[PDB]
Amino acid sequence: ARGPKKHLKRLAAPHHWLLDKLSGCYAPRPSAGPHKLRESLPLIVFLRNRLKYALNGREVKAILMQRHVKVDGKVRTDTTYPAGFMDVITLDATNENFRLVYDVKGRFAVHRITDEEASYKLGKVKKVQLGKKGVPYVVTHDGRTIRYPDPNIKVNDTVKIDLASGKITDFIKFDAGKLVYVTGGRNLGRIGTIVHKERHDGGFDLVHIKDSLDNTFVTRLNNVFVIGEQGKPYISLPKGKGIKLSIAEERDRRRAQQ
Amino acid sequence: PRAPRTYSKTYSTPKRPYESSRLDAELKLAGEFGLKNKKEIYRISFQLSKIRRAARDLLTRDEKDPKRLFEGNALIRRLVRVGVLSEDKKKLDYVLALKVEDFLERRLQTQVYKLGLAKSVHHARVLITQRHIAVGKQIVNIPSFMVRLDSEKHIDFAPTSPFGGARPGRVARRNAARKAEASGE
Amino acid sequence: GISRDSRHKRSATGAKRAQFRKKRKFELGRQPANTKIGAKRIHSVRTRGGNKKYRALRIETGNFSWASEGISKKTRIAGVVYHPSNNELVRTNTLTKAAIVQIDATPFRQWFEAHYGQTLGKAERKWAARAASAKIESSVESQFSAGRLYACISSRPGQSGRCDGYILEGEELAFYLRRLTAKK
RNA sequence: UCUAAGGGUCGACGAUCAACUU
RNA sequence: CUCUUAAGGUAGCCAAAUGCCUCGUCAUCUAAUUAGUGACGCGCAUGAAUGGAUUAACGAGAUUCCCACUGUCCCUAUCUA
RNA sequence: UAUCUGGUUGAUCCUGCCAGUAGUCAUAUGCUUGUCUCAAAGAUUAAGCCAUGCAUGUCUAAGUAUAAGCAAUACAGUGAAACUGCGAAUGGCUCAUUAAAUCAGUUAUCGUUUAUUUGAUAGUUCCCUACAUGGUAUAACUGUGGUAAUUCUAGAGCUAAUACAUGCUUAAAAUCUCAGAUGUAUUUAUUAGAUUGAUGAUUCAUAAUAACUUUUCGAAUCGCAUGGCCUUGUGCUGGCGAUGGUUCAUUCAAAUUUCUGCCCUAUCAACUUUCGAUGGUAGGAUAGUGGCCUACCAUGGUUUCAACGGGUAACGGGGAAUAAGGGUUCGAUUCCGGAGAGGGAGCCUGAGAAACGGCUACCACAUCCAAGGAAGGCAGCAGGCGCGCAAAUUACCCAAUCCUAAUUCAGGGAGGUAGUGACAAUAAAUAACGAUACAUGUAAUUGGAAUGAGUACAAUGUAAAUACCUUAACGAGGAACAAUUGGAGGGCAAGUCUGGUGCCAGCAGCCGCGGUAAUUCCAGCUCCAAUAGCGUAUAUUAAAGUUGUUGCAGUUAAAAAGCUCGUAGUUGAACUUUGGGCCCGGUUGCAACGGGGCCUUUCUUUUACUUUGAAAAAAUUAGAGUGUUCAAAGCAGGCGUAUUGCUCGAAUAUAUUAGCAUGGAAUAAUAGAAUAGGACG
RNA sequence: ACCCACUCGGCACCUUACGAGAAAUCAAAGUCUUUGGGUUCUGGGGGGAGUAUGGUCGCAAGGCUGAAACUUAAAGGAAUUG
RNA sequence: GCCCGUCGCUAGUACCGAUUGAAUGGCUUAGUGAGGCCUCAGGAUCUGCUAGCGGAGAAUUUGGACAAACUUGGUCAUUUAGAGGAACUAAAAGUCGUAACAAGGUUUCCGUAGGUGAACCUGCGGAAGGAUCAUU
Ligand SMILES: [Mg+2]
Ligand SMILES: [Mg+2]
Ligand SMILES: [Mg+2]
Ligand SMILES: [Mg+2]
Ligand SMILES: [Mg+2]
Ligand SMILES: [Mg+2]
Ligand SMILES: [Mg+2]
Ligand SMILES: [Mg+2]
Ligand SMILES: [Mg+2]
Ligand SMILES: [Mg+2]
Ligand SMILES: [Mg+2]
Ligand SMILES: [Mg+2]
Ligand SMILES: [Mg+2]
Ligand SMILES: [Mg+2]
Ligand SMILES: [Mg+2]
Ligand SMILES: [Mg+2]
Ligand SMILES: [Mg+2]
Ligand SMILES: [Mg+2]
Ligand SMILES: [Mg+2]
Ligand SMILES: [Mg+2]
Ligand SMILES: [Mg+2]
Ligand SMILES: [Mg+2]
Ligand SMILES: [Mg+2]
Ligand SMILES: [Mg+2]
Ligand SMILES: [Mg+2]
Ligand SMILES: [Mg+2]
Ligand SMILES: [Mg+2]
Ligand SMILES: [Mg+2]
Ligand SMILES: [Mg+2]
Ligand SMILES: [Mg+2]
Ligand SMILES: [Mg+2]
Ligand SMILES: [Mg+2]
Ligand SMILES: [Mg+2]
Ligand SMILES: [Mg+2]
Ligand SMILES: [Mg+2]
Ligand SMILES: [Mg+2]
Ligand SMILES: [Mg+2]
């Protein structure tokens, strides 16, 4: 329709932003950036709806233009910067670091972390490709290209990214029995261990995941993110650890507060 | 434009307009409970039809089916909280076997009367309409209120509303200002 | 202008399609280059995405490769002798991909002499190292006595502005020689 | 000014010969 | 209801190359139509192999309109044998 | 939330329709209209025509400042104008076109372009400036003007760049050619790319060789700080940044694209094919695939499983109304996709438009004019005309939601706010309680309270208000602060009441009522229904098992073809591992029910079906929680205090057509070895 | 040829109806609200009307296909008593 | 009792119909063809290096493809006029008869054909929905 759209009408925004319906006609359209339009979370949304620090978008940009907010080590003064999964949002005024991770309901949970582990971040290797001059490189889930990767880093593996030098410190290899986050689909926000991978040449790769409670759910390889081995996640998990209690036991946990 | 504003009807007229037995039953209910019009009975029967539909959908499901368990428990909880479903009838079949008077009993216009705060249901209606009744720390001027079975211990007069506190009223002041003259001085 | 859309061009059942969506710029075609010979004239076309194409009109020199010794000398195109798509292109000497042209062959003879030193068409022992196994063919050298080498265009002059190509060799050359000794 | 198609005789082709119609 | 015949003109068709009145009446065609066409029909005096009605094709047959075309005309002029 | 009733007869039972009845975010219209919350609204007819005003502009520290612009030893700040850059392709409107088209779900790009964002990435450039090249350049500005008029511009004099055009500095390392070449970009050819990376798969990524280019890039740019070492000079170095730039990846996208799915119509059965229709080769063109176009060649491609044609008062979908179940109808319209900007067509710029608040032309309209000429496009927001049954203010504002730019600041009729508004929806004032007489109720017999409908200091709210919430004083007695809209024969609740009219006037959806005895008209009284609403008209849904798959009927009520054959379609007998036994282990209450595994002669045809799973945006629907005072709603909120704060949420289900993955192997189809060209190692 | 008994197939018939139907009646018109063996054709109140128009067949007569505007509260079936 | 048709009056709705009728809209052959775009050229004047020679270049201009639009013709669709003709319906207690319902006074009806003011009559074949379930 003659070009790229610059508006995002409310009720067209991604639902996991928990945006109010009758606030205005429009939502913050995620600018082009590292992750995606749908799988992103704008800094305005995370500053005005997930922490209530700012009250308006004006106040969000006021917070942003004095270099308070910081996404993955850099300033990111963009009001609608598309921060996403495994991103580190550190603010030095009110010094605290968050890691954008998915709760078990499928929203971007507010997950405070410490500087000693916010130093780095994780990245799912989107592709391994030889660049110009025969220099190998890896592309990660957040759109990062890292040259001279370990010759044993393949697709669907995860790499620990320094986030200050932007290099690969370690890498977890996709295989049966490693801890995986689910970053899309019905089970978006669950954590489990890889049990089996169905190949489906041509079609879509499927993976069967068994959470701590021995629940076994299958999902597409596109949205599973290796985060370490069982019991040793290379990152800190949010308050729920992706267990996916049913509504009955959720109501039970709720009524356990009398 | 802004997202649409959801709205629903709350009542349903009867299919037969001039059924004399239904008319007499509606007038009996309206006289007993001090109702302004047949639309209040219509609204209560609409709520009851929705409740009955949900209960029927659940009862057709298998027992210990998670959806039936969860939603029937929620419906029964809501009904016993409102006081329509009694304490010993938490089975989802008594939900089906409920009635219009079970909802008309929990009306604040009925509770105010049954608590002696009013001389009749019409006294209760005017007393709620005139901001005289407070449920908690909150004046409630709506006859249809569906007391939560905990507000029952708290339905009393307001600090306003010169039957339960500070002020003496409005016509009392003018009658005092004219009784000053009526005294002669 | 010219449109490459399929909203015209009635469907496979034969039904005539109703029109919607007035012609879109992302479906435009353009005019053929009809590259001629001589006095190079290249025009820059602005294409989608800010890119540039080069319409070759009247091209004089092309880069042709022998493909047997891998030289790719730059030479002069004499004329078009065969075109599989239109004899009118041969008549008009219109330079075009897959056109069979004739090239000067003088740079190729000079390279053959500076490389093998073996009197093709009329630092000492490099000619010895490139040993007696230098017989090219009985049809690629008989053309050197006339100084015209049969070649096939491989670039697209209307698209890239260049008229590069390769010298005919082997069964391709036999095929085109049969075609030429028929149609000539 | 050209292009194409449509033949005879002789020994998948080769040699030779020939008239116009499109 | 009459008088009346061998039978009382049927099916059709018409101001028709058959209708006096008559340039019939209505419509169409035109600026204007005794023309043409379509209808109407108590039709001087239409009508059934003295053939009625109709008909594709055909016609140096009679007729009306239209397009083209033009010295037929407006309005004549000029050239050749 | 599975209902019927009146009307054919003297009466009956049916068929059957008409009529009634109920709903409609479904429109109009009539009457009436007190309060709070919510808020549809020129779609229908004329994608008809439009006066006027606004709707797109934009600056940081960080492109260019000698404003004769302001203000307290080159400007040090601000800064009009202008050049430059970016944007103006988003938004908003409308539904005219459009029926395999759009669109929906699902695919592909190993078939391409992609400004921007994000990340990575460039020691190789020279055939007498690099301690920095030119005007070949110009704007704004200064002065001279033409025209009636335009966001018209000529003529002359300067002036810069991150505008324009050129153009060097980086050794060392480094191999091939016979000292030179060797970065990248373009084009071609060849080579490797294995079994030395990837993919299911490549002529992929990538590298190499030989060359090739009307030269591509390889900063001649800017801000704030100035630091360290020192031949103390115009030294050498060194920050944090901004902007720019090649390529790759990423993102926002785009364009094509797989499969399946659109309403009525046969009084549309053949359609397409010279003039591209289907395919092949080659080319051209495109960003790229492709008959997209061209040349040559072949004669194909669609179709009763409905092609092609015609109609649509047809934009598609999410969804809406109604709904026992199944369905019927609707969907111009809050979100997604498409298309258009009076009708066509063409094109500039740009990453992106076949753009119309851009241009060019024609057609139809139509403005101005000094007659020479010039300027247009409300289906943006208001507003006018016209059309109509049918739809609001030429209002305020960027505070919210977001968007745009050079950007924290400016702009935004996008949007919000208010005005109109009985579209629709929510809650629910018009009275309540005593005394006296009479037999719990009757009376213009009377008393004390209560309140908001209003009105209004303030204060909250708001961008500034308005209103709502909260309230000082006022503001109830036939509380005239007076409720209506339709009815009273039946259907259908309610009158042999009174007066009037006399087959008239009229009523009456239908049956009927009215002709001097009217329960039916006109009224009065009384009564009934719903009620701030009620009636009427049209449409549609239920009623309708009167469209019937569930689920109709066809002897006589409408309906079995005159009869038989017969293609498509639909449908089609039975039969192939059953039955013992041993285990492990689940879920519910030793039992029941469900599995999985072994033995018992026993451990990769094609489909349908079905289980499970992923998918099927949000809104909507069902629905969990939550005292918006209740409610419609909304996604909030809750818990304690004198903190310098703690905490739960914004679930879940369904869309069962098509595709995908998985378990089952009954049902139904299909294939196996018969001239053995069969199986086994 | 006939008689008796049985049997298959056929034209029918008599009685009774579990059953069906509005009934007349029906061994199918039954096995139908306890509604599904397969399949073709037809009807949707009465007229206008098997009309007009178009198509097609026919020598013609006509056949096949086949509306609409408009109109109407009945028309119709079986049976009962007069 | 019920009832049928012609004819006559009134009103309404459709139909046929000379007029090579009319209007509007869609599609389209042919002709002409604006405009931009690509292309063959062209060279005002605008500066540069030395009459030698280059660069930028407006008007104009050739040929193409894209093509609006107009004219003519064809075709389709939808409205619409029309002398006259021929129906249907409604109303009307008009005229003529009495065709059907009883064996309706000739049983009725179906197909077909012919005839007659009108219902109708008649021939041929058929049906009972007949006025006969019946002659071993
Ligand atoms: Mg006669
Ligand atoms: Mg005559
Ligand atoms: Mg005549
Ligand atoms: Mg004449
Ligand atoms: Mg005779
Ligand atoms: Mg005669
Ligand atoms: Mg003759
Ligand atoms: Mg009805
Ligand atoms: Mg309109
Ligand atoms: Mg848009
Ligand atoms: Mg490659
Ligand atoms: Mg090709
Ligand atoms: Mg529709
Ligand atoms: Mg339309
Ligand atoms: Mg729509
Ligand atoms: Mg419309
Ligand atoms: Mg839209
Ligand atoms: Mg457009
Ligand atoms: Mg308009
Ligand atoms: Mg346009
Ligand atoms: Mg406009
Ligand atoms: Mg626009
Ligand atoms: Mg408007
Ligand atoms: Mg009142
Ligand atoms: Mg108030
Ligand atoms: Mg009355
Ligand atoms: Mg009654
Ligand atoms: Mg029926
Ligand atoms: Mg009959
Ligand atoms: Mg019948
Ligand atoms: Mg068959
Ligand atoms: Mg079988
Ligand atoms: Mg009928
Ligand atoms: Mg009868
Ligand atoms: Mg008779
Ligand atoms: Mg008779
Ligand atoms: Mg008789």
Swiss-Prot record, chain A:
Top-level taxon of the source organism: Eukaryota
Major location category of this protein: cytoplasm
Residue positions, PTM Phosphothreonine: T114
Pfam families: 40S_S4_C (PF16121), KOW (PF00467), Ribosomal_S4e (PF00900), RS4NT (PF08071), S4 (PF01479)
Chain positions with Phosphoserine modification: S31, S246
Domain S4 RNA-binding per the UniProt entry, residue ranges: 41-104
Localization of this protein: Cytoplasm
Keywords, sorted A to Z: Cytoplasm, Isopeptide bond, Phosphoprotein, Ribonucleoprotein, Ribosomal protein, RNA-binding, rRNA-binding, Ubl conjugation
The UniProt record lists the keyword Phosphoprotein: yes
GO molecular function: RNA binding; rRNA binding; structural constituent of ribosome
Gene Ontology CC annotation, any one: cytoplasm
SUPFAM superfamilies (UniProt xref): Alpha-L RNA-binding motif (SSF55174)
Cross-link (Glycyl lysine isopeptide (Lys-Gly) (interchain with G-Cter in ubiquitin)): K61, K133, K160, K167, K173, K178, K210, K232
A GO BP entry: cytoplasmic translation
SUBUNIT field: Component of the small ribosomal subunit (SSU). Mature yeast ribosomes consist of a small (40S) and a large (60S) subunit. The 40S small subunit contains 1 molecule of ribosomal RNA (18S rRNA) and 33 different proteins (encoded by 57 genes). The large 60S subunit contains 3 rRNA molecules (25S, 5.8S and 5S rRNA) and 46 different proteins (encoded by 81 genes).
Assigned protein family: Belongs to the eukaryotic ribosomal protein eS4 family.
Function: Component of the ribosome, a large ribonucleoprotein complex responsible for the synthesis of proteins in the cell. The small ribosomal subunit (SSU) binds messenger RNAs (mRNAs) and translates the encoded message by selecting cognate aminoacyl-transfer RNA (tRNA) molecules. The large subunit (LSU) contains the ribosomal catalytic site termed the peptidyl transferase center (PTC), which catalyzes the formation of peptide bonds, thereby polymerizing the amino acids delivered by tRNAs into a polypeptide chain.
Family annotation (HAMAP family): Ribosomal_eS4 (MF_00485)
Note, other: Present with 573 molecules/cell in log phase SD medium.
Protein name (database record): Small ribosomal subunit protein eS4A
Species annotation: Saccharomyces cerevisiae (strain ATCC 204508 / S288c) (Baker's yeast)
Curated annotation (Swiss-Prot), chain B:
Keyword Cell cycle part of the UniProt annotation: no
Broad class of the protein's primary localization: cytoplasm
Positions of modified residues (Phosphoserine): S183
PANTHER family: 30S 40S RIBOSOMAL PROTEIN (PTHR11831), 40S RIBOSOMAL PROTEIN S9 (PTHR11831:SF5)
Pfam families from the UniProt entry: Ribosomal_S4 (PF00163), S4 (PF01479)
Keywords: Cytoplasm, Isopeptide bond, Nucleus, Phosphoprotein, Ribonucleoprotein, Ribosomal protein, Ribosome biogenesis, RNA-binding, rRNA processing, rRNA-binding, Ubl conjugation
Subcellular location: Cytoplasm; Nucleus, Nucleolus
GO-annotated cellular components: 90S preribosome; cytoplasm; cytosol; cytosolic small ribosomal subunit; nucleolus; nucleoplasm; small-subunit processome
Name used for this protein in its record: Small ribosomal subunit protein uS4A
Subunit composition and interactions: Component of the small ribosomal subunit (SSU). Mature yeast ribosomes consist of a small (40S) and a large (60S) subunit. The 40S small subunit contains 1 molecule of ribosomal RNA (18S rRNA) and 33 different proteins (encoded by 57 genes). The large 60S subunit contains 3 rRNA molecules (25S, 5.8S and 5S rRNA) and 46 different proteins (encoded by 81 genes). Interacts with snoRNA U3. uS11 interacts with MPP10. Component of the ribosomal small subunit (SSU) processome composed of at least 40 protein subunits and snoRNA U3.
Biological process annotations from GO: maturation of SSU-rRNA from tricistronic rRNA transcript (SSU-rRNA, 5.8S rRNA, LSU-rRNA); ribosomal small subunit biogenesis; translation
Summary of the function given for this chain in its UniProt record: Component of the ribosome, a large ribonucleoprotein complex responsible for the synthesis of proteins in the cell. The small ribosomal subunit (SSU) binds messenger RNAs (mRNAs) and translates the encoded message by selecting cognate aminoacyl-transfer RNA (tRNA) molecules. The large subunit (LSU) contains the ribosomal catalytic site termed the peptidyl transferase center (PTC), which catalyzes the formation of peptide bonds, thereby polymerizing the amino acids delivered by tRNAs into a polypeptide chain.
Curated annotation (Swiss-Prot), chain C:
Span list, region Disordered: 1-30
CDD domains associated with the record: Ribosomal_S8e_like
Name the UniProt record assigns to this protein: Small ribosomal subunit protein eS8B
GO biological process entries: maturation of SSU-rRNA from tricistronic rRNA transcript (SSU-rRNA, 5.8S rRNA, LSU-rRNA); translation
Assembly description: Component of the small ribosomal subunit (SSU). Mature yeast ribosomes consist of a small (40S) and a large (60S) subunit. The 40S small subunit contains 1 molecule of ribosomal RNA (18S rRNA) and 33 different proteins (encoded by 57 genes). The large 60S subunit contains 3 rRNA molecules (25S, 5.8S and 5S rRNA) and 46 different proteins (encoded by 81 genes).
Ranges in coiled-coil conformation: none
Listed GO MF terms: structural constituent of ribosome
A Pfam family that the UniProt record links to this protein: Ribosomal_S8e
Family membership: Belongs to the eukaryotic ribosomal protein eS8 family.
InterPro entries registered for this protein in UniProt: Ribosomal_eS8 (IPR001047), Ribosomal_eS8_CS (IPR018283), Ribosomal_protein_eS8_euk (IPR042563), Ribosomal_Se8/biogenesis_NSA2 (IPR022309)
Function comment: Component of the ribosome, a large ribonucleoprotein complex responsible for the synthesis of proteins in the cell. The small ribosomal subunit (SSU) binds messenger RNAs (mRNAs) and translates the encoded message by selecting cognate aminoacyl-transfer RNA (tRNA) molecules. The large subunit (LSU) contains the ribosomal catalytic site termed the peptidyl transferase center (PTC), which catalyzes the formation of peptide bonds, thereby polymerizing the amino acids delivered by tRNAs into a polypeptide chain.
Phosphoserine PTM sites in chain numbering: S65, S68, S72, S85, S138, S139, S142, S145
Subcellular location: Cytoplasm
Record-listed Phosphothreonine modification sites: T61, T106
Record keywords, A-Z: Cytoplasm, Phosphoprotein, Ribonucleoprotein, Ribosomal protein
Lineage: Eukaryota, Fungi, Dikarya, Ascomycota, Saccharomycotina
Misc. comment: Present with 14400 molecules/cell in log phase SD medium. There are 2 genes for eS8 in yeast.
